[PDB]
């Protein structure tokens, strides 16, 4: 009903943006990653001066009702010994947006440049020495509102924030009231008595499992009892309390958020990390004194973590190990549990890092990344995720001889996204998968409210867009509180 309104609005208002209306504001991120660099022009209507609204934040459409987007590499990072080169980097950026944005709102118009894990490993007296030439020399170029504040590298946590403000709001879940068809929570307002709880829209959490890393972010509605003061010196880390709304007084849009980002624990990395171990095992005296030690291919390692039958091989410090799969689903989860680098302490999910209670009956979490091609693009069961469903196809996959496998790719069975590498570990990334949910992060076997997706509302989740939302939070003040701040005259 009102889900399937807005989720049928977001695909059909795409209108280009009528730059000819002067009650249209506009403001620019700039998105400085390892590989590149993308600017997003949004723009918002005038704000309807209900304290409980925030801005109507949309993506900028162009006269072909296309998002105002463009991309360069191969990113700010690579002129960690050039910084006077970099403001002539980003210029075909902000020629882009200066063309898009009227040349009357320029004055009005926001610049936020925020940077991530391309920045972020060069030394401290190297990023300040871009964001300055950045500073110093974009205000005589352009025309946008550029101050220290708006050039920033941005840390993992906050970028798990903003991600997380992202996908909640094209979700509507910071409009309140109307909540009728949407689930509700309690919420504990951090400094606040337990009677001073809140009732609101419930929000969605993200789980993303990337290539190298793993990402889990969302919201702990309730107050949380720590049980030592160094975990609490460990959770503040991992922990962001923010306020939404333009009211510093009111606690409708406080928000406390939990981001936890896990290196060395995406689905390939741990693949790698694996194949390590295999290797280094090879001078144990179980390997050598059996037929499994993988110095021929004669006697290879058998690896339950591969498709049954596939020859595979390890190189590494010029040797070579040779592995023949034996598409064992249910071993390979077994086999691949130290990976996860679990302790036994308490409240504690990979690596031994501080998770707080997720409330499991009353949630609902996003699965992005492997998440989605772990299960959409050779099993064909993306979206909401059912454990038995799951771990039967994919044990069933597994099983299939890697020729039969094979013949299907070639035939065109599986996902157009699904190439040879996505064939070959799939079985691994999906039982990967399964253990870092149900025993890495401790989700219930028979978790209901997990959806595993590509984009949200047929786009792709902007965390740009959770940063220009809170970045601009403020504005709404200038038409609700203009006589809260009026000047005051003396009579001397
Ligand atoms: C998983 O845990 C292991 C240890 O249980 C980590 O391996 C250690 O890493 C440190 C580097 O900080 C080395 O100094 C040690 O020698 C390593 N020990 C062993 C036995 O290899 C490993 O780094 C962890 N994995 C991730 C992705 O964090």
């Not at 609005?9 to 993308?38: F, H, K, L, M, W």
């Not at 970099?86 to 063309?99: G, K, M, Q, R, T």
Request: proline residues 4%.
């Amino acid at each position: 009903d009102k889900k399937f309104q807005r989720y049928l609005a977001r695909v059909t208002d795409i209108e280009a943006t009528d730059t000819n209306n002067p009650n249209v504001n506009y403001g620019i991120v700039v998105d400085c990653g390892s590989s590149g660099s993308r600017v997003f022009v949004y723009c918002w209507p005038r704000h309807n001066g209900n304290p409980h609204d925030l801005l109507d934040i949309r993506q900028m459409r162009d006269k072909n009702r296309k998002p105002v987007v463009m991309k360069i590499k191969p990113g700010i990072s690579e002129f960690a010994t050039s910084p006077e080169k970099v403001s002539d980097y980003i210029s075909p950026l902000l020629n882009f947006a200066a063309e898009h944005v009227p040349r009357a709102k320029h004055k009005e118009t926001p610049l936020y440049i925020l940077c991530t894990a391309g920045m972020r490993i060069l030394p401290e007296s190297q990023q300040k020495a871009i964001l300055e030439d950045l500073l110093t020399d974009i205000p005589v170029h352009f025309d946008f509102l550029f101050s220290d504040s708006h050039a920033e590298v941005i840390s993992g946590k906050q970028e798990g924030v903003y991600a997380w403000i992202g996908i909640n709001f094209v979700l509507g879940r910071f409009e309140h009231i109307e909540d009728d068809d949407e689930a509700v929570v309690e919420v504990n307002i951090p400094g606040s008595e337990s009677s001073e709880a809140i009732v609101r829209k419930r929000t969605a959490g993200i789980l993303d499992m990337g290539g190298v890393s793993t990402q889990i972010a969302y919201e702990v509605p309730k107050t949380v009892s720590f049980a030592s003061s160094q975990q609490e010196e460990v959770a503040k880390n991992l922990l962001a309390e923010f306020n939404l709304g333009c009211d510093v007084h009111q606690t409708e849009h406080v928000y406390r958020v939990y981001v936890a980002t896990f290196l060395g624990f995406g689905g390939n990395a741990a693949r790698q990390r694996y194949e390590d171990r295999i290797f280094a095992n090879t001078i144990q005296k179980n390997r050598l004194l059996g037929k499994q030690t993988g110095l021929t291919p004669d006697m290879p390692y058998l690896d339950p973590c591969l498709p049954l039958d596939i020859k595979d091989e390890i190189q590494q410090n010029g040797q070579t190990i040779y592995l023949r799969g034996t598409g064992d689903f249910d071993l390979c989860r077994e086999t691949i549990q130290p990976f996860m680098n679990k302790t036994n302490e308490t409240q504690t999910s990979l690596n031994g890092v501080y998770q707080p209670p997720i409330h499991f009956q009353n949630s609902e979490f996003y699965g992005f990344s492997e998440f989605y091609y772990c299960t959409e693009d050779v099993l064909r069961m993306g979206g909401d995720y059912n454990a038995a469903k799951f771990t039967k196809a994919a044990k069933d996959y597994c099983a299939t001889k890697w020729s039969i496998l094979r013949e299907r790719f070639d035939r065109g069975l599986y996902a157009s996204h699904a190439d040879l590498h996505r064939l070959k570990y799939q079985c691994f990334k999906s039982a990967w998968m399964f253990e870092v949910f149900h025993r890495g992060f401790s989700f219930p076997v028979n978790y209901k409210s997990l959806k595993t997706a590509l984009q949200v509302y047929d786009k792709e989740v902007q965390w740009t867009l959770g940063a220009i939302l809170y970045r601009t939070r403020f504005l709404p003040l200038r038409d609700i509180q203009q006589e809260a701040f009026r000047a005051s005259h003396t009579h001397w």
